[PDB]
Structure formats: C-alpha cells, structure tokens
Paper text:
Glycosylation catalyzed by a series of glycosyltransferases is crucial for biogenesis of SRRP adhesins in Gram-positive bacteria. dGT1 is a unique bifunctional protein involved in the biosynthesis of an SRRP adhesin Fap1 of S. parasanguinis. It is essential for glycosylation of Fap1 by two distinct glycosyltransferase activities derived from the N-terminal and C-terminal regions, respectively. In this study we demonstrate that the C terminus of dGT1 (CgT) is an independent glycosyltransferase, transferring GlcNAc to the Glc-Glc-GlcNAc-modified Fap1. Thus we conclude that CgT catalyzes the fourth step of Fap1 following the action of Gtf1/Gtf2, Gtf3, and DUF1792.
The x-ray crystal structure of CgT (286–582 amino acids) was determined at 2.4-Å resolution. The space group of the CgT structure is R3, shown in dimer in symmetry unit. Each CgT monomer has a triangle shape and contains three regions: an N-terminal domain, a core region, and a helix domain. The N-terminal region consists of β1-β2-β3-β4 and α1-α2-α3. β1, β2, and β3 make a parallel β-sheet surrounded by α1, α2, and α3 to form a Rossmann-fold. The core region consists of six strands (β5 to β10) and six helixes (α4 to α9). β7, β8, β9, and β10 lined in the center clamped by α5, α6, and α7 form a sandwich shape. At the very C terminus there is a unique helix domain consisting of three helices. In the CgT structure, two monomers bind tail to tail together through the helix domain. Because all key binding residues of this CgT dimer were located in the helix domain, we designate it as a helical binding domain. CgT contains a unique helix binding domain in addition to possessing a typical GT-A-type glycosyltransferase domain. Noticeably, this helix arm is not crucial for GlmU activities. This is in sharp contrast to the helix domain of CgT, which is important for enzymatic activity of CgT in addition to its role in the oligomerization of dGT1.
Numbering used by the authors:
A (entry chain A), B (entry chain B): 4 to 153, 160 to 218, 229 to 295
C-alpha cells in the first residue's frame, strides 16, 4: 500500500505514550511513517520518543521548542511525505486493524477522506466504554452536503479517526496558539473533498480522565464560509445558539466580561429579536 | 423636544475640535447634552474641552486614561442621560439643522432609529465634495429586512449620522482595543429596531485628509447572527468575499502571515470548491 503519514504531537504524556506507540507499531497496514513531534516536553516523553525511534525506522522524531498543539501538528504536516495523512493523539490508542480499515474504505470507494468512530477508555476505572457495537456497524459514502448535515465532536472538533489525501492540505494549517484548533480546521479539509466515506466502528480509543472565545469565533467563521459556498446552515445555526448559551454563562463565571457582554447580546438578539 | 445625548470621543484633535464644537453649539435643536470623552489627549485637546465647558452648560467633560475609541464611546453611553443617543467624531462638523432633521424623521414616523447621509470636506484643498445633492434628496421608512439588504460604509461601519433610541443600547457596547469598532457594533443596534427612517441629505461633513483581522471576523460574526435570525445573506456574502480578497493580499504585504494563510484558504474554498 501507499505511504500513510501518522502525525503524533507529544507533550508531557509519559504515562500514556508507550501504550500509544505500541498500538501503532502493531498495525496490520505496514507502509506508514510515524512523525512524533515532541513539543518541548519536560517529563520523560522526549526520552521515550528516542527509545522507540531506535527500534523502528518508520518512526521520525521532531524535537521543537514548545509552541502548542497547532504548531506541533503543522510541523507534522510539513514533514510528512505520505500520500495520506492521519492524526493520532499520544493520549490514545488504536486497534491493530485501524489503519487498514481506514485505507480500504478510502481507496475501494474512491473517496478523498475516510472517517471512523471511536470508543472510550476510562483511565480512572481502567474500563472500556463500547458505545459503538458491531450490531450498529455501517459504512456509507457521502457527498459534502450530506456529510455537513448532521456526534458533532467526532465530525468537526476531533482531528483523529480520519484519513486524508495529502493534497487536501494545500493552504490548510491549524491556527497558532489557540485551543479548539481541530474545531477550526478539520471541516475545511472536508470542503476540499468530493466524497467522504464513513465507517461506524470504534477502532480508535479515546482515553478519558476551556477556550470560550474560540468556541464562538470558530462557529461564526464556519457559518460564514458554508453560507458563502452555498451549503445548508440549519444544523450549524443550532450548534451556534447552543455555544452562545454556554459562553454567556461560562464567560461570566470566569470573569471574561467583554466576552460575556458579546455572547449575551448575540443570544438576546437571536431569541428576542428575530426577523418579522 | 426630549434630551438628545451627543457622544464625542476626543483624542488629539486640537486642529479640528473647535470647528466641531462650534457646529454643535449652533444646533437649532436646543435640548441636548454634549459628552466630550477626552481619551487622555496629549496635545491641547483637553484644554480646548475645558474652555468650551465653561461657556455652555450642555457640555459635560469626561477625562479618562487613554483606552481607545471603543472605551471612549462606551463611557459616553454609560454617562448619557438622554432619551436618544447620537455620535459625532471630533474631526468632523455638521449643518445647523442636523439634529433637528434627524429628530423629526424619527419621531414623526414612529421609528426607533433615524439615519442621514454625509458629504465630505477635503482638508488638503479646503473644499467640499457635495456627493449628496438636493435633487437626489429622499426620505423613506424601512423594515429591518429592507434596511439590511443594500454605501455599506455609511450604513454599517460609520457610527455618526444616526439617532438611536437610548433603550436600544441594552447589552450593546463597542469591542475594546479594536479598530473597525463601528463595523462590529452599529448593525447590532439596527437589529433591535422595528423601523428605520433614512433621509438622503448630506448634513454631516466627513473631514478627509488598518485592522485586517477585525475586518474579516466582524463580517463572519455578522453573517452568523443574521443567518441565525433568518435575514437574507446575499449582500453580506458579497461583502465578505470582497474583504477576503483585500485581506489575502494586504496581510501578506504587512507580514501578517497566519492571517494571510487563513484568508487565502477561505477565498480558495469559496471560489474553487463551491457546493456540487
């Protein structure tokens, strides 16, 4: 198979990194590179990275001065030479057939992107939560319009579980210094695609154990773009109202007063002054 | 007539302030207060303010530590006790019948807001440009939907030439530390109104002699709000695409590289990947 680039930002994850890398080296799909971007870790993460690189030549390390998750992923994208690009968080781990299933689903269907689901692992209790069962398995091709019309966490705000043609990344980078960076970026990759293939399997495990401002501005930017391109807004509008409610209260609790002012005003307009 | 609050931010306008204030004290509509917000001027502006306060008791001065145009206007809004609120830039000046015409247009039509046009004065050549002639005069009542469907400078991004019921300002303030603050605020006041009256007279004179980021996020925010409230997006979408073009090139010229990738990417999507 053609080369897949796995981009893995690493920042102070010494407890979890070995589990992650072991689950990647066990992939049944062999032709990958793993790009570990150590974002200036101050625990043993950087050492663990070096140790794994010494026993598998598919692992490439980039050490860099701490600059945040966006900067780490953008470095991953710049360094990747694969035909495909996928993201794995160093907190998490995957089934041994993860990559292969994503690959087949993309190539056999002629899609530009393939997406699977995830299950969770509760670290506090050391137990899986299998929300996605075999009985609920399905696979499906989508147009972009069908894809954009929906969880919203899996789809828009979570960068892993997805396999991207590398050419999609022309002009697309994660926004610097900001959290909710996936939220701002992943959907722009969808808008580049012609067809997206989804597989409802939980092959990625999300280990389980805020940036209000970005939450709001990401939603506004996404709505403006979709509108300018002629996509339907119904769901994005509901999402936006929901985020405004959360912001209006949480900004106040955090003492983010100008943000509070803004969000309340916006929520006041939508609810009490709609068009007549 | 009921009290009109005229909010006038003052920052280092010693050359122009006397002209502005003289044109205001000559108003045929007498029942106003002028709130001068000296935003920590370092020329003779603050002294000129004090001199005028001594000969007309309708003038109230607020001195404050320099905090920007938004902070100055927000201070004006907080201190205003009028039933109506209007803005005058200290750079500019008005006809003697300016306030009266705005007042009548609002009250006689039962509107929540009245708006007039402006002409310009070229300071370098000391000459008027009468774009708005008497032969092109008209007056008209508008719904918000009719109003929102258009210059765009006069309407959305320019805070003077408009008379607002004071009640409209519940929850509405100019955004701190940002330029294009008018761009972000004025239209939110329109959305509070039931009916807007426009008078096509150039009774305000704009004296004639950048914030790329805000330009873009203001447009995205406005589109998201309007969409959420059910208004039409056609013109805003055209406005947005135009600002992206300007941003894509100007951000690059200024060395604003992350902003440049963002705007190019957005413009690339809109023009080369519209919905299929």
């Amino acid at each position: 198979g053609e080369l897949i680039s796995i981009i893995v930002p690493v920042y102070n994850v010494e407890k979890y990194l070995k589990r992650c890398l072991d689950s990647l080296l066990r992939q049944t799909y062999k032709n990958f590179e793993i790009i570990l971007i150590n974002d200036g870790s101050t625990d043993n993460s950087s050492i663990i990275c070096e140790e794994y690189a010494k026993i598998d030549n598919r692992i490439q390390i980039l050490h860099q001065t701490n600059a945040g998750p966006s900067a780490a992923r953008n470095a991953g994208i710049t360094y990747a030479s694969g035909k495909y690009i996928t993201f794995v968080d160093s907190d998490d781990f995957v089934e041994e057939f993860y990559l292969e299933h994503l690959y087949r689903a993309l190539v056999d269907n002629g899609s530009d992107i393939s997406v699977c689901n995830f299950n969770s692992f509760n670290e506090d209790r050391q137990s899986f939560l299998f929300s996605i069962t075999k009985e609920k398995y399905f696979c499906k091709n989508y147009t972009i319009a069908e894809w954009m019309d929906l969880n919203l966490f899996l789809t828009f705000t979570f960068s892993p579980t997805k396999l991207f043609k590398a050419e999609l990344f022309e002009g697309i980078r994660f926004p610097l210094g900001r959290l909710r960076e996936d939220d701002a970026t992943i959907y722009r990759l969808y808008l580049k695609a012609s067809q997206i293939t989804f597989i409802n399997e939980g092959s990625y495990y999300y280990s389980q154990r805020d940036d209000i401002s970005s939450m709001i501005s990401n939603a506004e930017e996404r709505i403006a773009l979709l509108a300018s391109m002629g996509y339907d807004l119904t769901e994005q509008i509901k999402s936006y109202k929901g985020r405004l409610k959360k912001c209006c209260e949480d900004a106040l609790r955090n003492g983010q007063i100008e943000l509070y002012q803004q969000c309340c005003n916006k929520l006041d307009l939508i609810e009490n002054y709609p068009k007549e």
